[PDB]
Amino acid sequence: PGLEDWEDEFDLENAVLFEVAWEVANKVGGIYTVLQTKAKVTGDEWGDNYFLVGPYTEQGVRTQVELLEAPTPALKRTLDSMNSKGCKVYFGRWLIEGGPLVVLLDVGASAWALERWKGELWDTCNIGVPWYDREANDAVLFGFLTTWFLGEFLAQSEEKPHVVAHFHEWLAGVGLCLCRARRLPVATIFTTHATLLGRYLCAGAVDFYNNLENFNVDKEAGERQIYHRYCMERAAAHCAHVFTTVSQITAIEAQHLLKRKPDIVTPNGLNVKKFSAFQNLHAQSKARIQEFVRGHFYGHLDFNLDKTLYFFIAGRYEFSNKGADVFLEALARLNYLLRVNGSEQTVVAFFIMPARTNNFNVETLKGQAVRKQLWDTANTVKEKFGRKLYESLLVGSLPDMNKMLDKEDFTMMKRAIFATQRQSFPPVCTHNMLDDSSDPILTTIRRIGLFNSSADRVKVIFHPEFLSSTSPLLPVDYEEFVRGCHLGVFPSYYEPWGYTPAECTVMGIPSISTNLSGFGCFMEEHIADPSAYGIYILDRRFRSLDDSCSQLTSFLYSFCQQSRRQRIIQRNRTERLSDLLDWKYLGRYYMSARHMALSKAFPEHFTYEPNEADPRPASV
């Protein structure tokens, strides 16, 4: 389909690009995966002219960085001068899929120059940094060393090439500000993945999404003592040849907060080849989740397991940001509706959110051991029955069915039966809370009244611990378990881009998101009639909370009323949707951003035609 070499035929000649980011070869956040995935295609387009600028960490260099010698004499002399001037910079490869060249800068080896660098920064842009941040000083040092390295590289080259600088986050924006300050012949691109004040204002302040035009950012930066971070972020955003954002919602957020409309939007992608390794895997995962729910619900298995649906929500433990309260309230409403209608369907909800636990509870382990004992007894009895039937059937005689069970088989069956006796109800959580009184999820469940009762048609399972293949009760990784679920509900409120819903959708599981996330807006914009492809968008921007909850309840009820053939068709449609989120297509927006940057920086040599051409209308 649409490859990188479609329509951007451009004279690249002697051009070098720097992918400056604070997290390269240092796993801190989530856009680490974005850089790791984009590196392969970007380097394939760029050949050997792709560099990454980032801080040095002993752990990172020990685990995934292989030190090497730089291939050009210019890098040799720049590194020699850089080490001989009182700093400490190393060179090597990044041990990832693409294997790009990396320069690592040790911010701890330049503490002597912070006093003069702060003064120069203030004399250049009137930016001050308080002494107690311990993070902004690191950003300032990283920017100073980055701009000094760029200046030395351009100055010491016999022939000056076209250098492109690309920064990603406000810990690196000081470098962009300084390189623009010193009038270096460089093309600067600034891309933001999350507004700094967005996270601060969403928590505490109410109706942050209904008051964008009524926010005078200066004060809100003032009272929180994050004024200087916003100052450098906004300054770096302003003095950029090309300004870029990751999603539309963040685009409006930056426009109303950073006071600059982003020129191009660049969604985050991923490599679909590794995830693709498609119904056998889902069937196996569903069967083993059936095994798990049989283990947990021993002694209360009064509902058909062929008409049960599995819902799940995952991510970091943010009750409000992920909208778990909305999901719980809508689950209660759906339980009420199903109980009224007298339906045979059952909904089992999973909640994978980290919490502060110590160990498992006795009930879950007891149930799992009981299930294992029942399975073993059934296997032993069925093996004996099969052997007896085979031997009695070779002699051409009908099996006398009343004599295939003897004393010890009855003893084992009886032991199993008394093992499956229980008077209480299955627990709603599989661990022991250390803050059970202050837990919001459990408090909400208690308020809405879901205790896995016999009459309840909706079951709630809370699994705080990270999902691992070595777990005593769920020995499975995140990917395989997600593959088997029926639907993924993410009623998020504030999220610049949804990594988890993207992973769910690329997997081929129908998902529910909001118009309030980058993924939701991307899907809504790039396809028509999204409901047919297994994606349901919750309108949260132009609606109240009760409206958002009723709509989500209606979506869930509509999903629960679908027949098996309808579910199969919807699942096939969502299967044939993974290629929209791969870097093979999403990498073109970054390339267009680069072309804009070169056109702005060197209009004499480069000229760009503003082509914004780039699709899935319908299937029924």
Binding site: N126, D218, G222, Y227, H228
Partner: protein
């Protein structure tokens, strides 16, 4: 004025209604572009 404003910068008391507002940084920065 200059030195005392610089001090208020490191100790972090910014008069963001007036001289320490981002507008001054804007009019200083816009000359370089």
């Amino acid at each position: 004025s200059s030195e005392e404003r610089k001090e208020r910068w490191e100790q972090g008391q910014a008069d963001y209604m007036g001289a320490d507002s981002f507008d001054n940084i804007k009019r200083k920065l816009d000359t370089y572009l």
